[PDB]
Amino acid sequence: QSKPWNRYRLPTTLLPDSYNVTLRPYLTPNADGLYIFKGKSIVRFLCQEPTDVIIIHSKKLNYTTQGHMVVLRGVGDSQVPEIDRTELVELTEYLVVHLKGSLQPGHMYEMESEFQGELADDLAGFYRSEYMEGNVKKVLATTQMQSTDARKSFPCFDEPAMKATFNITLIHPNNLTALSNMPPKGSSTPLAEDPNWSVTEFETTPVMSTYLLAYIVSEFQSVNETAQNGVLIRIWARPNAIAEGHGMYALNVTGPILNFFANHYNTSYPLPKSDQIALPDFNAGAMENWGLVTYRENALLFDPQSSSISNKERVVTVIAHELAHQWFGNLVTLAWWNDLWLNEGFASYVEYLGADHAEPTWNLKDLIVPGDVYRVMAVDALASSHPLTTPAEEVNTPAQISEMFDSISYSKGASVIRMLSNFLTEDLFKEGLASYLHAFAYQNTTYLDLWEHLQKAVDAQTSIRLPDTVRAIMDRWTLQMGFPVITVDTKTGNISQKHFLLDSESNVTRSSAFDYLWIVPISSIKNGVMQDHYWLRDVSQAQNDLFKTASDDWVLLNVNVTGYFQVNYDEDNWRMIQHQLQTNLSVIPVINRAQVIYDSFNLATAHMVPVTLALDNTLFLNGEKEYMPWQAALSSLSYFSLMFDRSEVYGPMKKYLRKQVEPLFQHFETLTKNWTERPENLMDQYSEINAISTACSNGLPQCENLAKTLFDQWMSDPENNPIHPNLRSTIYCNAIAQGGQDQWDFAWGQLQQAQLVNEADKLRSALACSNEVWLLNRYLGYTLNPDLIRKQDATSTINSIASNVIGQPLAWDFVQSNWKKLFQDYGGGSFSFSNLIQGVTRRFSSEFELQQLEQFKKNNMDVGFGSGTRALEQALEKTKANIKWVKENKEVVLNWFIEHSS
Numbered sequence: 083q084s085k086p087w088n089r090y091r092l093p094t095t096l097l098p099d100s101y102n103v104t105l106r107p108y109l110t111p112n113a114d115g116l117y118i119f120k121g122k123s124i125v126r127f128l129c130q131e132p133t134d135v136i137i138i139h140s141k142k143l144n145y146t147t148q149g150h151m152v153v154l155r156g157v158g159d160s161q162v163p164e165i166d167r168t169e170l171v172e173l174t175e176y177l178v179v180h181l182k183g184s185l186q187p188g189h190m191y192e193m194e195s196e197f198q199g200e201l202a203d204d205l206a207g208f209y210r211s212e213y214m215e216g217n218v219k220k221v222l223a224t225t226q227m228q229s230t231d232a233r234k235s236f237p238c239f240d241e242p243a244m245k246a247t248f249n250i251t252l253i254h255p256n257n258l259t260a261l262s263n264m265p266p267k268g269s270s271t272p273l274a275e276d277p278n279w280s281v282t283e284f285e286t287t288p289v290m291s292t293y294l295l296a297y298i299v300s301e302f303q304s305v306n307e308t309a310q311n312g313v314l315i316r317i318w319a320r321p322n323a324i325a326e327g328h329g330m331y332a333l334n335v336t337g338p339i340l341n342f343f344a345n346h347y348n349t350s351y352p353l354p355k356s357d358q359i360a361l362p363d364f365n366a367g368a369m370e371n372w373g374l375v376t377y378r379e380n381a382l383l384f385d386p387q388s389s390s391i392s393n394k395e396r397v398v399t400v401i402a403h404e405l406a407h408q409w410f411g412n413l414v415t416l417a418w419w420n421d422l423w424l425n426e427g428f429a430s431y432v433e434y435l436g437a438d439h440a441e442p443t444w445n446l447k448d449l450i451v452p453g454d455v456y457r458v459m460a461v462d463a464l465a466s467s468h469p470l471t472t473p474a475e476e477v478n479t480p481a482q483i484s485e486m487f488d489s490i491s492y493s494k495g496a497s498v499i500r501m502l503s504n505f506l507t508e509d510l511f512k513e514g515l516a517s518y519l520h521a522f523a524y525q526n527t528t529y530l531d532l533w534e535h536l537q538k539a540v541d542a543q544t545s546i547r548l549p550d551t552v553r554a555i556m557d558r559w560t561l562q563m564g565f566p567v568i569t570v571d572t573k574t575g576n577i578s579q580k581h582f583l584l585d586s587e588s589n590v591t592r593s594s595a596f597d598y599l600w601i602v603p604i605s606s607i608k609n610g611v612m613q614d615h616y617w618l619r620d621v622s623q624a625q626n627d628l629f630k631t632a633s634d635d636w637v638l639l640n641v642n643v644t645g646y647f648q649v650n651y652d653e654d655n656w657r658m659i660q661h662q663l664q665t666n667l668s669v670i671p672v673i674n675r676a677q678v679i680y681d682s683f684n685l686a687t688a689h690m691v692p693v694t695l696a697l698d699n700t701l702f703l704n705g706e707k708e709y710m711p712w713q714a715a716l717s718s719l720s721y722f723s724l725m726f727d728r729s730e731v732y733g734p735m736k737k738y739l740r741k742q743v744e745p746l747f748q749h750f751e752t753l754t755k756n757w758t759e760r761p762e763n764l765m766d767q768y769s770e771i772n773a774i775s776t777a778c779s780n781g782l783p784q785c786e787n788l789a790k791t792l793f794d795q796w797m798s799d800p801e802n803n804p805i806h807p808n809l810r811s812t813i814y815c816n817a818i819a820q821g822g823q824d825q826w827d828f829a830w831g832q833l834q835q836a837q838l839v840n841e842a843d844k845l846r847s848a849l850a851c852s853n854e855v856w857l858l859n860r861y862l863g864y865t866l867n868p869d870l871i872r873k874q875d876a877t878s879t880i881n882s883i884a885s886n887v888i889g890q891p892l893a894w895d896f897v898q899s900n901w902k903k904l905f906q907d908y909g910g911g912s913f914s915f916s917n918l919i920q921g922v923t924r925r926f927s928s929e930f931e932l933q934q935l936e937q938f939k940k941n942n943m944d945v946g947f948g949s950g951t952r953a954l955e956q957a958l959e960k961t962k963a964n965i966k967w968v969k970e971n972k973e974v975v976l977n978w979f980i981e982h983s984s
């Protein structure tokens with residue numbers, strides 16, 4: 083055997099019943115500058131199988147328990163063996179209690195300990211967060227257990243399936259508020275040893291996982307509402323934030339979201355209250371702790387005076403996301419981290435459903451397509467991708483567990499679940515989902531359990547018919563990586579699938595059980611009329627008259643891109659879609675108008691259509707009003723801009739884009755009443771934002787005039803910003819671009835005296851838009867000055883300067899030169915040499931720039947690269963790729979743009 087304390091997974095011989103946990107953070111340093119917390123815990127557990135060893139998680143805890151590190155008692159009239167010794171095994175993060183005899187099956191035991199650890203500013207376990215309020219540095223105590231950090235706060239059986247009830251007490255300064263998962267039992271009472279402290283006890287949690295515990299000590303205040311069923315809702319934030327009203331939007335949407343989900347899941351919200359809390363600089367973004375959800379401030383707070391519509395969208399969807407988890411994930415918990423994708427994928431999908439309930443005029447459900455589908459297809463169309471599923475026995479270490487939290491798990495998980503709900507129909511999906519939640523409430527599952535309950539719902543009805551079982555179908559989408567391109571020859575109705583890769587020369591080495599064949603749900607529209615639904619079975623090719631066209635007719639597959647795949651056609655069918663898009667675009671769903679664009683640029687990249695065909699798919703845009711298709715274009719073209727914006731190709735590119743966007747600019751000019759009022763709904767606001775951005779950055783004089791007029795206006799009356807927050811990033815940037823040191827120095831002043839992050843970020847990025855070398859160089863001169871630019875903003879600012887075509891050589895020169903600064907900043911704080919390198923080499927696309935990158939790397943002797951060592955190799959490979967892509971494409975692209983710009 084090996085010794086069980088040297089294995090990463092816990093024994094199954096002992097299961098927890100319940101914990102008492104008392105934590106006391108010391109928010110004042112011990113004057114060698116160390117912040118600590120103290121804790122006491124008791125865990126009651128049940129012996130399942132005889133064992134003479136107790137193994138429990140512990141991380142970075144010092145034990146001050148009297149005697150051994152624990153005290154062990156029997157519950158009721160159980161005898162307990164004597165402890166031999168207690169030891170800490172750091173590698174597997176264990177406290178290990180060796181006993182002189184065995185525990186006995188069916189008996190319960192109580193294990194008591196006393197302990198302390200650092201209250202570090204490290205965003206892990208029970209930790210400190212420091213922030214400014216006026217003159218004073220404030221410090222609060224808060225938690226982040228996700229994934230394996232509960233054990234950093236108190237000793238516990240720290241695996242998601244080993245659920246228990248938790249009785250939490252905080253000992254805290256008596257003028258601070260204490261929060262946890264559950265409401266407080268009553269009023270706080272003074273600590274007898276020192277009445278300057280108070281004692282807050284919380285009601286017993288339900289049976290729950292350790293990674294979902296939270297407790298917070300702070301000066302925060304709240305806005306409150308009581309839902310009609312007496313569920314108390316509160317948004318917590320800094321006193322000044324609450325006083326400004328920044329908590330109101332979150333409060334507004336929370337009640338509707340919770341209502342939606344309780345109905346959606348057919349399951350009552352399982353707790354007496356919902357707290358949500360805005361934390362300054364919470365780098366983890368948001369965390370779904372049961373009854374006490376934590377957010378970074380800009381994820382929860384909203385200022386109507388400065389915040390844009392996209393800020394508003396981020397808040398409502400992040401809230402819907404976290405709140406989804408309060409049933410799916412928290413009430414029913416995946417047994418192990420290898421199934422993380424199901425949990426995060428599910429929430430990443432239903433976040434749109436919940437938010438759509440809160441904001442039902444916004445069409446938010448559409449945003450999953452650009453937001454998750456195409457986003458993850460970019461990485462899932464690579465040889466280096468991976469399956470959704472991972473065998474449980476391969477996910478053991480805390481590092482391995484961490485690697486589960488990626489794009490695939492969230493965005494593809496979301497995409498494939500959305501696919502699943504769509505082929506089942508939502509009503510059927512909901513039935514199976516309620517069945518699953520009711521059967522497994524307060525317990526743990528695998529994805530197989532969800533498939534089973536969905537199968538049950540399918541089996542219980544006669545109307546939806548599938549080509550195989552729910553499991554066999556989803557096995558194709560979960561056990562193998564990637565996704566198919568579906569190619570339709572419309573002359574015959576032949577239809578094929580192959581594994582899609584952006585690099586047509588890629589060697590795939592990861593094998594599939596299914597030889598990279600899928601079972602594929604295929605919806606289709608013909609001449610703008612929905613056709614019967616079709617399933618592509620697990621074959622390379624098939625035929626169906628559904629996909630056979632006449633010479634005037636067209637067909638279009640994957641309505642609303644509900645299916646996780648991309649579609650190619652014969653050129654004839656492509657041209658018919660094109661003619662349709664030019665003559666009456668309304669016949670084709672707006673999501674598909676985007677699809678045509680998204681897919682065809684990926685297909686061109688993969689050498690499956692010519693690049694000119696993808697470009698042809700943008701021609702219809704001069705009469706396109708809607709957000710998504712334009713966004714598809716701008717997303718697909720930003721690489722073209724990156725490659726060509728210093729070349730002869732650029733002028734015709736700009737001209738062409740000016741041509742395309744001018745009518746949209748005109749359209750919004752009227753709709754908005756000389757730009758005085760925004761469009762009403764979110765999609766049209768987004769379209770306006772993009773139209774103005776596109777117009778201005780391509781040098782449409784009317785947009786240039788608008789941007790100079792408004793920024794002139796703001797400058798002559800600084801306390802009244804005339805520029806709507808939606809339009810700010812463009813109007814700032816374009817105006818600093820047309821302007822000199824007057825405009826620059828003014829925005830600089832405004833950046834220094836800004837109070838709000840979102841607004842500081844927009845000024846910082848706009849300042850990089852100057853066309854004066856001397857301003858950009860001076861500005862770079864500031865980025866290393868922490869008095870003028872925060873370190874966490876430095877590499878970002880340098881990238882923004884690199885982004886500017888004039889700034890490219892300035893940034894690149896500046897990085898090379900002060901690279902001698904890994905040794906101040908792999909020192910003082912992290913930095914992200916990796917993001918810096920990517921941003922500043924992003925453009926490189928010639929042999930000459932590759933020689934420079936190689937010549938740069940030749941400072942290998944010492945210094946090195948730190949967290950960008952990998953990133954510098956990724957730069958030399960991406961340049962090689964860019965060199966190749968520019969030779970293959972430059973001529974063809976030049977002549978297209980010339981020929982289509984008039």
Ligand SMILES: *[C@@H]1O[C@H](CO)[C@@H](O[C@@H]2O[C@H](CO)[C@@H](O[C@@H]3O[C@H](CO)[C@@H](O)[C@H](O)[C@H]3NC(C)=O)[C@H](O)[C@H]2NC(C)=O)[C@H](O)[C@H]1NC(C)=O
Pocket residue numbers: 102124192249
């Ligand atoms: C985990 O925490 C629980 C809450 O502290 C403990 O349960 C509490 O035990 C208390 C004392 O042991 C009881 O409070 C009072 O104590 C006096 C002492 O003189 C007793 O007479 C009274 O029974 C009691 N007073 C009242 C008004 O009940 C509580 O009864 C009890 N709290 C409960 C049950 O909610 C657990 O013992 C502790 N677990 C372990 C394993 O130590």
Ligand SMILES: *[C@@H]1O[C@H](CO)[C@@H](O[C@@H]2O[C@H](CO)[C@@H](O[C@@H]3O[C@H](CO)[C@@H](O)[C@H](O)[C@H]3NC(C)=O)[C@H](O)[C@H]2NC(C)=O)[C@H](O)[C@H]1NC(C)=O
Pocket residue numbers: 114118119144198199200201
């Ligand atoms: C958990 O226990 C740890 C092990 O005892 C503590 O870590 C030790 O902290 C010591 C003091 O805080 C450090 O030792 C020396 O401290 C004196 C004065 O404090 C200084 O003169 C010395 O410069 C310093 N020694 C050195 C070699 O730097 C140690 O850094 C450290 N010892 C070890 C073995 O890590 C933790 O502080 C303790 N944590 C909590 C939260 O209680």
Ligand SMILES: *[C@@H]1O[C@H](CO)[C@@H](O[C@@H]2O[C@H](CO)[C@@H](O[C@@H]3O[C@H](CO)[C@@H](O)[C@H](O)[C@H]3NC(C)=O)[C@H](O)[C@H]2NC(C)=O)[C@H](O)[C@H]1NC(C)=O
Pocket residue numbers: 330331334384386
């Ligand atoms: C939380 O929900 C509240 C109620 O749904 C929203 O309150 C609405 O705020 C609107 C924007 O401030 C107000 O609209 C208009 O405000 C201007 C201010 O001068 C007035 O001219 C208009 O008369 C007024 N609108 C109407 C339709 O009369 C609404 O007055 C106000 N609605 C209510 C019921 O009070 C909050 O906006 C919302 N909070 C956030 C941050 O979104």
Ligand SMILES: *[C@@H]1O[C@H](CO)[C@@H](O[C@@H]2O[C@H](CO)[C@@H](O)[C@H](O)[C@H]2NC(C)=O)[C@H](O)[C@H]1NC(C)=O
Pocket residue numbers: 100101102124125126247248249286
């Ligand atoms: C945490 O508190 C709860 C509830 O106050 C305790 O639950 C009690 O458990 C005792 C001992 O098993 C039972 O006799 C009572 O019936 C329980 N009360 C309720 C309302 O469930 C629980 O034991 C505490 N946990 C620990 C570790 O002490």
Ligand SMILES: *[C@@H]1O[C@H](CO)[C@@H](O[C@@H]2O[C@H](CO)[C@@H](O)[C@H](O)[C@H]2NC(C)=O)[C@H](O)[C@H]1NC(C)=O
Pocket residue numbers: 110218257258301
């Ligand atoms: C809670 O009590 C503490 C201690 O009296 C207050 O903390 C002091 O606040 C002043 C500013 O008003 C600082 O200059 C001191 O350094 C603070 N002392 C410590 C030990 O940090 C605190 O302001 C009170 N907070 C609330 C919300 O009432």
Ligand SMILES: *[C@@H]1O[C@H](CO)[C@@H](O[C@@H]2O[C@H](CO)[C@@H](O)[C@H](O)[C@H]2NC(C)=O)[C@H](O)[C@H]1NC(C)=O
Pocket residue numbers: 344345348349350
């Ligand atoms: C969960 O869904 C079930 C099934 O729709 C709900 O039960 C139905 O509720 C409607 C509401 O008036 C009744 O007309 C039906 O007769 C009920 N059917 C059954 C089988 O009871 C139930 O209300 C939902 N529960 C929750 C907590 O949302």
Ligand SMILES: *[C@@H]1O[C@H](CO)[C@@H](O[C@@H]2O[C@H](CO)[C@@H](O)[C@H](O)[C@H]2NC(C)=O)[C@H](O)[C@H]1NC(C)=O
Pocket residue numbers: 097243244245522525526527
């Ligand atoms: C993990 O979840 C399973 C269910 O998926 C739990 O097993 C169930 O336990 C309950 C309560 O004891 C019983 O009603 C069921 O018969 C069990 N179902 C089984 C064994 O398939 C299991 O207890 C959970 N694991 C842990 C460690 O709590």
Ligand SMILES: *[C@@H]1O[C@H](CO)[C@@H](O[C@@H]2O[C@H](CO)[C@@H](O)[C@H](O)[C@H]2NC(C)=O)[C@H](O)[C@H]1NC(C)=O
Pocket residue numbers: 571574576625
């Ligand atoms: C559509 O599919 C059919 C195959 O199902 C193709 O027709 C076959 O082509 C081979 C060529 O050697 C013949 O031997 C078979 O007898 C043909 N089958 C028939 C006529 O039923 C056809 O090429 C495909 N069309 C495409 C891909 O455009």
Ligand SMILES: *[C@@H]1O[C@H](CO)[C@@H](O[C@@H]2O[C@H](CO)[C@@H](O)[C@H](O)[C@H]2NC(C)=O)[C@H](O)[C@H]1NC(C)=O
Pocket residue numbers: 445448641642671672673
């Ligand atoms: C494709 O997506 C569009 C939305 O982009 C869907 O149209 C929505 O349909 C729902 C219910 O049918 C309406 O309540 C919405 O108001 C519609 N929005 C718009 C802007 O039309 C359409 O149903 C989807 N098509 C299919 C076949 O699923």
Ligand SMILES: *[C@@H]1O[C@H](CO)[C@@H](O)[C@H](O)[C@H]1NC(C)=O
Pocket residue numbers: 587588589
């Ligand atoms: C893939 O293998 C073939 C060998 O037949 C080779 O031509 C090609 O260069 C290899 N790799 C890539 C990434 O293209």
Ligand SMILES: *[C@@H]1O[C@H](CO)[C@@H](O)[C@H](O)[C@H]1NC(C)=O
Pocket residue numbers: 666668669
């Ligand atoms: C656009 O197509 C729809 C499809 O029925 C049709 O009703 C409408 O008349 C068309 N619009 C125009 C301007 O012809």
Ligand SMILES: CC[C@H](C)[C@H](N)C(=O)O
Pocket residue numbers: 228366367368369370426487
């Ligand atoms: C700290 C946040 C964690 C990772 C949470 N589960 C999320 O996905 O947002």
Ligand SMILES: [Zn+2]
Pocket residue numbers: 370403404407425426429430
């Ligand atoms: Zn999540």
